[PDB]
Chain A
Amino acid sequence: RKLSHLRKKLWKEAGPPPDLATRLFSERIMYLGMPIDSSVAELLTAQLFVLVQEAPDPIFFYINSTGIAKSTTKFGNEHEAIAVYSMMKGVQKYCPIYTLCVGNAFGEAALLLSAGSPGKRAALRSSTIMLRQPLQRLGGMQASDIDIYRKITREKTATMAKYLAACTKKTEEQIMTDFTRPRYFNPYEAVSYGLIDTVLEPKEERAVFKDWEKMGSEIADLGLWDDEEQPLP
């Protein structure tokens, strides 16, 4: 029914359009590549609704995000990540969602990395998957807000831990003990923890060993007070 008409949309409607966003949406590819925000979350929800409605065919999700923002710039909320995550979980039973991490996936995007359909969830070997320190760089409240503020931040931090255990099949106690400082996994460590299912090694590898930099000279003679030379590699 709708397969031939994805074809026909390609023939008449979705081939000509110029925008790279339009071409990507034609290829069922959703590139999350920017501090996730309110506008980004609404865009991703619209894209994912329409992509469901097209077909039960799969979706590709490339993630190069630095969290909700960088720590040196004003953060947004944690609710955009939860909104996108819930949309993805609702979608997944009717559409496979490969989720692939190119580059980086800091904190919130890490959730969006772990929210892909199990077994179809990958990160490049040269990526980093950060479960960063929790959270909220917004500091524009007063003391008249204290009575609410705790019941928010826990309310946010604990919500994330729960969702992360529903993606790594782990104990939320571990995730809580791991939040306290930003802990960023290698892809192999991530597969061990459960964040991703595979690691995408490149076809060809370039970087080799650098251990040939090691000195290996003898231990210093007991009668040689070393000078203060402070060198660089």
Chain B
Amino acid sequence: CRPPGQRQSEWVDLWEAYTYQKVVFIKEAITEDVANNMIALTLYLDSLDQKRIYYWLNVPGGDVVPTLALYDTMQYVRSKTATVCYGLCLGMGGFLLTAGGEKGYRFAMPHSILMMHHPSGASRGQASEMHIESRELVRMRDYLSLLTSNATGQPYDRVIRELSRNKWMDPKQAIEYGMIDKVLTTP
């Protein structure tokens, strides 16, 4: 998916060409690097003007802190946000799918595969260090569960019990569960 596609007058790269139209393709699992690039892109796109930012996600997973940073940047910008799911949204990608446009602007392709699970993490040290890290990670689970529950409309206690293991969904299950809002078809 490299070839620069022609723009208004010149040859510009495919992903830069997309962002010229506010479209932000996220295609890699969210590591520090991709998250920083997408946070920067979101901030600059909101800088140009305020129309709307569509995020097309193919995320197969990712790390928790960078994903929450990207979420907070999406919420901070003036322009609204819509998230479409081309391919699949797993874990923190399935959390980003519930990060933009609560009012009926989450779409998914018909065979997109959706998955949510409680955020992972790992850290060791002293005893007290493990206390501090464990308390922080429990705070993180609770925050992401509050966000998931207020995004989908499911009870907080239900979400806690559901996401402890992996949770997989077809787009029909995702509409019925409240994860997304519409499924893209030929139109």
Contact = CB atoms under 8 A, between A and B. Distances in A.
B37 interface: yes
A123 B32 CA distance: 19
A16 B12 CA distance: 10
B147 A206 contact: yes
Nearest to A182: B132
Given A27-B47, A202-B75, A206-B102, A103 B16 contact: no
Contact of B39 (A31, A66, A72): A31
Interface in A166-206: 182, 200, 202-204, 206
Interface bracket on B: 35 or more
Nearest to A34: B36
B16 A18 contact: yes
B130 interface: no
Nearest to B160: A233
Interface in A88-105: 102-104
B43 A31 contact: yes
A107 to B, nearest CB: 15
Contacts of A232: 164
Nearest to B68: A103
B95 to A, nearest CB: 12
Given A64-B36, A233-B160, A20 B68 contact: no
Contacts of A221: none
A213 interface: yes
A2 interface: no
Nearest to B37: A20
A16 B13 CA distance: 12
Contacts of A20: 37, 40-41, 44
Interface stretch (B84-92, B109-117, B149-157, B166-174): B149-157
Contact of B69 (A16, A103, A182): A103
A233 B68 CA distance: 22
B76 interface: yes
Interface in B17-65: 32, 36-37, 39-41, 43-44, 47, 65
Given A33-B39, A34-B36, A200-B76, A72 B123 contact: yes
Interface in B138-166: 142-143, 145-147, 150-151, 156-157, 160, 164
Interface in A1-55: 16, 18, 20, 23-24, 27, 29, 31, 33-34
B6 interface: no
Contacts of B120: none
A24 B40 contact: yes
A219 interface: no
B12 A18 contact: yes
Contacts of B132: 182
A124 B132 CA distance: 22
Interface in A200-216: 200, 202-204, 206-208, 210, 212-213
A126 interface: yes
A62 interface: yes
A102 B32 contact: no
22 contacts: A20-B37, A20-B41, A24-B40, A29-B44, A31-B40, A33-B36, A33-B39, A62-B39, A102-B69, A103-B39, A103-B72, A104-B65, A104-B69, A124-B76, A126-B143, A182-B132, A203-B75, A204-B75, A206-B151, A207-B150, A212-B156, A233-B160
Interface of B: 10, 12-13, 16, 32, 36-37, 39-41, 43-44, 47, 65-66, 68-69, 72-73, 75-76, 78, 102, 123, 132, 142-143, 145-147, 150-151, 156-157, 160, 164
